[PDB]
Design an enzyme around this catalytic site. Structure first.
Site, PDB file in Angstrom:
ATOM      1  N   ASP C  99     -46.099   7.450  18.144  1.00 57.27           N
ATOM      2  CA  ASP C  99     -47.938   7.004  18.188  1.00 57.27           C
ATOM      3  C   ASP C  99     -48.347   5.719  18.720  1.00 57.27           C
ATOM      4  O   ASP C  99     -49.545   5.874  19.028  1.00 57.27           O
ATOM      5  CB  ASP C  99     -48.045   7.143  16.303  1.00 57.27           C
ATOM      6  CG  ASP C  99     -48.029   8.300  15.864  1.00 57.27           C
ATOM      7  OD1 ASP C  99     -48.260   9.284  16.557  1.00 57.27           O
ATOM      8  OD2 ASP C  99     -47.575   8.444  14.618  1.00 57.27           O
ATOM      9  N   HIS C 141     -54.614  -0.613  11.257  1.00 55.75           N
ATOM     10  CA  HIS C 141     -53.102  -0.027  10.971  1.00 55.75           C
ATOM     11  C   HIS C 141     -52.219  -1.420  11.747  1.00 55.75           C
ATOM     12  O   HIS C 141     -51.037  -1.214  11.315  1.00 55.75           O
ATOM     13  CB  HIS C 141     -52.776   1.146  11.357  1.00 55.75           C
ATOM     14  CG  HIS C 141     -53.655   2.278  10.776  1.00 55.75           C
ATOM     15  ND1 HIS C 141     -53.779   2.233   9.361  1.00 55.75           N
ATOM     16  CD2 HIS C 141     -54.255   3.194  11.258  1.00 55.75           C
ATOM     17  CE1 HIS C 141     -54.517   3.325   9.090  1.00 55.75           C
ATOM     18  NE2 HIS C 141     -54.843   3.987  10.233  1.00 55.75           N
ATOM     19  N   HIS C 178     -58.476   7.226   7.147  1.00 56.02           N
ATOM     20  CA  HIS C 178     -57.276   6.734   6.589  1.00 56.02           C
ATOM     21  C   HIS C 178     -57.274   5.392   5.760  1.00 56.02           C
ATOM     22  O   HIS C 178     -58.223   4.490   6.025  1.00 56.02           O
ATOM     23  CB  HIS C 178     -56.575   6.473   7.983  1.00 56.02           C
ATOM     24  CG  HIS C 178     -56.147   7.802   8.719  1.00 56.02           C
ATOM     25  ND1 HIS C 178     -57.086   8.304   9.690  1.00 56.02           N
ATOM     26  CD2 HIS C 178     -55.219   8.667   8.379  1.00 56.02           C
ATOM     27  CE1 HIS C 178     -56.447   9.279   9.993  1.00 56.02           C
ATOM     28  NE2 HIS C 178     -55.683   9.988   9.383  1.00 56.02           N
ATOM     29  N   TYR C 312     -62.415  11.053  16.701  1.00 55.72           N
ATOM     30  CA  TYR C 312     -61.447  11.862  17.596  1.00 55.72           C
ATOM     31  C   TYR C 312     -62.271  13.145  18.153  1.00 55.72           C
ATOM     32  O   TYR C 312     -61.804  13.519  19.248  1.00 55.72           O
ATOM     33  CB  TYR C 312     -59.995  12.312  17.202  1.00 55.72           C
ATOM     34  CG  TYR C 312     -59.324  11.240  16.787  1.00 55.72           C
ATOM     35  CD1 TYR C 312     -58.618  10.154  17.493  1.00 55.72           C
ATOM     36  CD2 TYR C 312     -59.491  10.660  15.300  1.00 55.72           C
ATOM     37  CE1 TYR C 312     -58.092   9.002  17.128  1.00 55.72           C
ATOM     38  CE2 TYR C 312     -58.853   9.355  14.782  1.00 55.72           C
ATOM     39  CZ  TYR C 312     -58.073   8.694  15.794  1.00 55.72           C
ATOM     40  OH  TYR C 312     -57.692   7.690  15.178  1.00 55.72           O
TER      41      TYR C 312
HETATM   42  C1  LIG Z   1     -50.629   9.173  13.331  1.00 56.68           C
HETATM   43  O1  LIG Z   1     -51.913   9.616  13.592  1.00 56.68           O
HETATM   44  C2  LIG Z   1     -53.024   9.143  13.282  1.00 56.68           C
HETATM   45  C3  LIG Z   1     -53.070   7.581  13.007  1.00 56.68           C
HETATM   46  C4  LIG Z   1     -54.088   6.832  12.539  1.00 56.68           C
HETATM   47  C5  LIG Z   1     -55.354   7.586  12.664  1.00 56.68           C
HETATM   48  C6  LIG Z   1     -56.574   6.882  12.411  1.00 56.68           C
HETATM   49  O2  LIG Z   1     -57.803   7.395  12.878  1.00 56.68           O
HETATM   50  N1  LIG Z   1     -56.627   5.329  11.579  1.00 56.68           N
HETATM   51  O3  LIG Z   1     -57.727   4.853  11.438  1.00 56.68           O
HETATM   52  C7  LIG Z   1     -55.258   8.759  12.987  1.00 56.68           C
HETATM   53  C8  LIG Z   1     -54.218   9.673  13.274  1.00 56.68           C
HETATM   54  N2  LIG Z   1     -54.521  10.824  13.811  1.00 56.68           N
HETATM   55  C9  LIG Z   1     -54.644  11.315  15.044  1.00 56.68           C
HETATM   56  O4  LIG Z   1     -54.513  10.576  16.207  1.00 56.68           O
HETATM   57  C10 LIG Z   1     -55.144  12.720  15.233  1.00 56.68           C
HETATM   58  C11 LIG Z   1     -55.451  13.064  16.796  1.00 56.68           C
HETATM   59  C12 LIG Z   1     -56.057  14.172  17.010  1.00 56.68           C
HETATM   60  C13 LIG Z   1     -55.956  15.196  16.309  1.00 56.68           C
HETATM   61  C14 LIG Z   1     -55.620  14.997  14.728  1.00 56.68           C
HETATM   62  C15 LIG Z   1     -55.120  13.952  14.572  1.00 56.68           C
HETATM   63  K   LIG Z   2     -60.566   3.753   4.592  1.00 56.24           K
HETATM   64 ZN   LIG Z   3     -58.549   7.101  10.999  1.00 57.94          ZN
END
Ligand SMILES: COc1ccc(C(=O)NO)cc1NC(=O)c1ccccc1
Ligand SMILES: [K+]
Ligand SMILES: [Zn+2]
Ligand SMILES: COc1ccc(C(=O)NO)cc1NC(=O)c1ccccc1
Ligand SMILES: COc1ccc(C(=O)NO)cc1NC(=O)c1ccccc1
Ligand SMILES: COc1ccc(C(=O)NO)cc1NC(=O)c1ccccc1
Ligand SMILES: [K+]
Ligand SMILES: [K+]
Ligand SMILES: [K+]
Ligand SMILES: [K+]
Ligand SMILES: [K+]
Ligand SMILES: [K+]
Ligand SMILES: [K+]
Ligand SMILES: [Zn+2]
Ligand SMILES: [Zn+2]
Ligand SMILES: [Zn+2]
Lengths: 398, 411, 398, 414
Positions: C99, C141, C178, C312
């Site tokens: 990731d 994160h 998240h 996204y």
């Molecule tokens: C491990 O994946 C993630 C990790 C963190 C975040 C996030 O937005 N954190 O604020 C989002 C995601 N999700 C994604 O990156 C995602 C991208 C395209 C379509 C669906 C999901």
């Molecule tokens: K939050």
């Molecule tokens: Zn998020």
């Protein structure tokens, strides 16, 4: 006041190494067997307030990755398990191997001598003593991130750095059979520390430096140019020739540099009876080249740190450094010191067989080129450092 | 009855050294400002009928010549030759232990206090006695060390063990190894020393740690196995410290069964000490200090509680004030509630910028010390064998098994 | 004054990532298409005097071996060749993989967001701005020595740490889909930074935290006990239910904590049109849960940092954050901001098809158990931190 | 004739900003105390016949709105007048904030540098001076509509622009300052006739961010493609590696471009003792100062030259550097030995050169894989591309001969 470094834990640490065994205990027990200790001010070795303080003191010269590696080396040798291939590789990258093997107390052993030579420098600095003796120290081969010549931490570099930071100039005199390369290197770019090592040099002989490099004599870089002095000598030189070769150089360095402190490495492996068997110096006091040089340096009345170093015949090293110790006491306090020619009875009395005398058991033009070369380098150094001096008084010393 | 050592001349003398300044005044006045002093029986410092009886008390441990030199150093500083300097250095009366105008009276006052504290336990006037003016564990028979000139601890333990099968348990919570107490009783089975401390290379004083594989020395002769050491790496917090020595303390009390406990309670383990090695606190909802003091007092064994190190003076006062209130609570069974805000008193301004009782600190598989538990408990089993004491495996096992660690206990 | 971070290099750097491509440019150019930049004070991103200065700022939170690893990851992806096995292990040990992959500008990209959120904190502190916006930041994160969820450097932790060392209490509000674990973790032991995140949480959903853990809610440790707040919500939640779920929590935290600054992470992936398709929040301003919450937080009149985060569907994130910008302009300066329902012509207009509207294209008791839990935690916090608060004035908000 | 820009009002104004204090006075008084002023033809700063001629001179490069705002910031800071919220927004729109604040004399201060560097440009044009020094100038960060890095008006851009339109004409700009000369580079990005070369530190987060990889080097556009040269270096470089880094690049730029004027920004923040502590240069003159080495080499081409100041935030050490540069300029151009005593002469600011009161900066220089031979190769390939685009002779043999002195001929493209 003449100072001398020791203490009970310090004596144990200086005696824990595989290469110098109990030499330190023979030395201090013969000094004590001759009733010299009440004449001397005990200088206790320095201790620190925390790991960070110890680290900041040692990485004043050494790299912390090297300090980390030397500490890890002790840990590994306090377990029963072999080193991993990765850890051999790490140790190799610091030359912690071959001539610098690990052993269960290598880091405490190595650090004691730092603690000892730092306390000696402090005792000079607060003017508690005018001379301090440290026979546990004098490990002049250690470099910033590299063990060498059974030297893991360069206690001299650290002590010298502590004196020069208190114009403050230091003269370093290295009487060891081997070239003081680590010290010379540490201050290669510094003009406030003049280093002078007299040593044997010949092809293949440790450490390799201190001589021609036509080849040239290197002698400093940057503002430090002309500030590293070197006199290499061939084998067989006796007391008087060694004395005559070094004496004028010593006197001219004092006149021209006017040092605020003098640090003397007194490695005893020039003795005729050292197992190297290269030089023929003695501990005789009718004259020992070592005693000639100490007395000359002590006649300058500059605060002085006397340090140990090499010495692989342990009882004769004890015989030398005992005489050096009483000679310092005589010269500084002015107080006649009467040493019996017989070793006194004490714990180690049986090591001084089979004769039990204090004298060691021994029966006894290229230098003129070196002399003109060095006097020229001293003029160059005096020039470069706007140092006012009489060319004729100095040229008269030879 | 909980006793505490103070007096006017006592406090002037405790406050007269260059190293420890007015620290004893802050401590006693914070305790006074929290209104604890009416709960406590004042234990007056010992005085003697003659210099000769004083000299006799002090040389029950210290050499006549080191005491003479300590005397000479003080008279000297009230008005040196090369021979004076050499004589002082011969006793380490230099560097970390310098002379100053009251150096002898200052060192003697802690002996007066700790010995008087000892007598109040012996004659049962006090179940517990506190001396925050004492706790000087580095001082040797013929040697000053670590701003310790006379060893009140050795002298008080000696009075305790000479009163009429008596065993003293000595517990040293100070940041540093109690080498002075350990070395004095090294050949003696009836005084068991236990020290928890930091040890690392180049850290004062260098003992109380490892010394073929390296070993722990732990007593010699009739004293074999009677000197216990727990050296810990820097960084430890209240809980790991408490978990570290808690079971060792109960196991020592179970087996040795001491007639007195002497506790040196130096405060340089605080997160806010300028040593910055351990991260202990004075917190009370938990402080590893208060946890250990409460465990020791739960044995109902007569106890001496001594000061020691501690170089943040307001924070040292904060801790020993809490310790004092805890001791009153544990012994008298009497609730002592201490306001979070420091009370009005003449040193209030030293407790800034917060002026509160908790120290200004924010606490935030590898580092365990379970092989130390196992070694220490094997040392304790040897100690019991050499000395023909009952070694109650069941009680010790049940102890360590509360933690899940019964397997570390030998049979 | 309302401040916004941008700059031509800053925009190039925020737009070089594989995960977020040109989002930041869609965002700033839509803000620009709507004649909004003249109302805003540009806060330039912070730059440093030297490498050492940058390193000190970033290792205020991040470990220097982690910062080293991230810089090495950039250099390695600026070479044509593959990583060694040893470099793969190194990156793995900081989760620089999967990731969080490397790419040619990954260190500059990550560092830009830190430069912007640190310039924003500083404009608050010197009081040049009442509110500052950084749509380039909000990477909640990243941990001390670990990348996570495409966050390599935690700009928020750093901006927050700068705010609390300027007694100072920071309220952190995390509107992202998240859980803000990294920010919650950084201040897990600190009572001066109270963190509150609302988010989806369900088994297997990233990152896993911010919910029951009869499992309990963890909420801080040490003197930080009760200072980390969390509201996990079931999927499908709409603007009004979301607004009503958080609204009382926000008013309560303000009343009780009385923050010196508010830092708002405003990730746009709760939008109905986000590809996560978890929540059903909109950008509608007749009401958007985002707009309701921002406007509530701004009515408190505390200096406020507004940050981006997830999002996204890039045009729709642009749609939300443009409305957020205008609301902030309106709520702080007092002047009405008329926003056309149609997307004005500009560089990226074609991305907003096929209807080119500013409204996103969408047709629209467990929480009472959560409210009573949070209210009690707030009381535990207030009592632990000797804070005065009318119990009943707070309880009435519910 | 070696010219230098000075005057009583000029000094007052160059000494009136918060950031650079009395630095200009220390420089000029140190040159004066070493008795160098009589060797030098004083070049008076330019003055104009009206506000409108001033305004048109400055808007040869700077926008009307940015200049107007610069005027207003100064007017504003001369009253008690705190800014209106709109005042604040207008100023922020021009970055007249943070690193470029207002102060009572911000416009006069900024205009003074233009007055000195334009006057200096005129003196080269009319051949009154072979070389001119302005230590009040060299503000390379200023943009068309933006103040930057305490640069508010870009005297360098304005000076280069006067030279390059005097009566084929090419100017070479050489930027030795610690920082990327981004503002001079942007100004002439589309222009082949002013070739910019900057040496500098670059690293992530370091001001101002440009002059490095983007992975490719951008180097100008349209007609100015290949005309913008950059050599970013890692921290820690000493005089010798820096001298060896740019020496052959400079001789090759002179061989191929054949400039009619050279303009040298000589900001002193590469000194070992600068609070930036990034490069390790010195002012030593026997082990030779990178600065003096480059100034000596540029003057050897006998091309009319402008020497400008710039960064430099240890003010005594900046004066030590620039005073030595000034003596060497006099020496190289007039053929006249200038011996500078190692003791700082008696003068009003003697007390600022403590505790040694010596001319050498108080620094102690100490010590395969740090070489930059790929940059040399990239830069020489760029220079061949510039020569083709612009239909200039690329004398391969001479440039080869040049790099083969080092043993690096193989680096030179055909
Ligand atoms: C491990 O994946 C993630 C990790 C963190 C975040 C996030 O937005 N954190 O604020 C989002 C995601 N999700 C994604 O990156 C995602 C991208 C395209 C379509 C669906 C999901
Ligand atoms: K939050
Ligand atoms: Zn998020
Ligand atoms: C590599 O070997 C050395 C390296 C350094 C020194 C030394 O004393 N330097 O000062 C001495 C030695 N010599 C020895 O280690 C040696 C020991 C016993 C007999 C013969 C020689
Ligand atoms: C030799 O130094 C000591 C020796 C002994 C002790 C001690 O308290 N032992 O219990 C403490 C020290 N510590 C100190 O002297 C010290 C004082 C202030 C700051 C940092 C350190
Ligand atoms: C944004 O800050 C700058 C911007 C531009 C320059 C510069 O000299 N450019 O040539 C220098 C700086 N550096 C500084 O202002 C600075 C001053 C003293 C200590 C450390 C740093
Ligand atoms: K030698
Ligand atoms: K030297
Ligand atoms: K202890
Ligand atoms: K014992
Ligand atoms: K918190
Ligand atoms: K430059
Ligand atoms: K150009
Ligand atoms: Zn040797
Ligand atoms: Zn202590
Ligand atoms: Zn600069």
């Amino acid at each position: 006041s003449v100072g001398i470094v020791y203490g009970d834990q310090y004596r144990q640490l200086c005696c824990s190494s595989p290469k110098f065994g109990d030499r330190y205990a023979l030395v201090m027990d013969l000094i004590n067997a001759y009733k010299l200790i009440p004449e001397l001010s005990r200088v206790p070795p320095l201790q620190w307030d925390s790991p960070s303080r110890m680290y900041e003191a040692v990485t004043a010269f050494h790299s912390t990755e090297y300090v980390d590696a030397l500490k890890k080396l002790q840990m590994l040798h306090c377990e029963e398990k072999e080193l991993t291939a990765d850890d051999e590789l790490l140790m190799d990258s610091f030359s912690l191997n071959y001539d610098c093997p690990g052993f269960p107390s290598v880091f405490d052993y190595s650090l004691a001598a730092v603690q000892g030579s730092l306390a000696a420098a402090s005792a000079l600095i607060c003017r508690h003593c005018e001379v301090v003796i440290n026979w546990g120290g004098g490990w002049h081969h250690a470099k910033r991130s590299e063990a060498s010549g059974f030297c893991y931490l360069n206690d001299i570099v650290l002590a010298i750095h502590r004196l020069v930071s208190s114009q403050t100039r230091v003269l370093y005199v290295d009487l060891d059979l081997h070239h003081g390369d680590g010290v010379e290197e540490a201050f290669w770019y510094s003009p406030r520390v003049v280093t002078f090592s007299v040593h044997h040099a010949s092809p293949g002989f440790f450490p390799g430096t201190g001589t021609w490099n036509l080849p040239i004599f290197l002698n400093g870089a940057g503002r430090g140019r002309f500030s590293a002095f070197n006199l290499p000598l061939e084998e067989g030189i006796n007391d008087l020739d060694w004395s005559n070769a070094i004496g004028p150089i010593l006197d001219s360095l004092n006149i021209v540099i006017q040092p605020s402190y003098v640090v003397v490495q007194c490695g005893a492996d020039c003795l005729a009876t050292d197992p190297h068997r290269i030089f023929r110096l003695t501990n005789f006091y009718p004259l020992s080249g070592y005693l000639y040089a100490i007395k000359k340096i002590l006649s300058w009345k500059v605060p002085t740190l006397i340090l140990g170093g090499g010495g692989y015949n342990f009882p004769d090293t004890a015989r030398l450094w005992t005489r050096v110790t009483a000679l310092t006491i005589e010269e500084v306090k002015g107080k006649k010191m009467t040493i019996s020619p017989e070793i006194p009875e004490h714990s180690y009395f049986s090591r001084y067989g089979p004769d039990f005398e204090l004298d060691i058991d021994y029966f006894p033009d290229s230098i003129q080129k070196h002399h003109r070369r060095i006097l020229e380098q001293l003029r160059n150094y005096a020039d470069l450092n706007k140092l006012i001096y009489d060319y004729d008084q100095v040229y008269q010393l030879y």
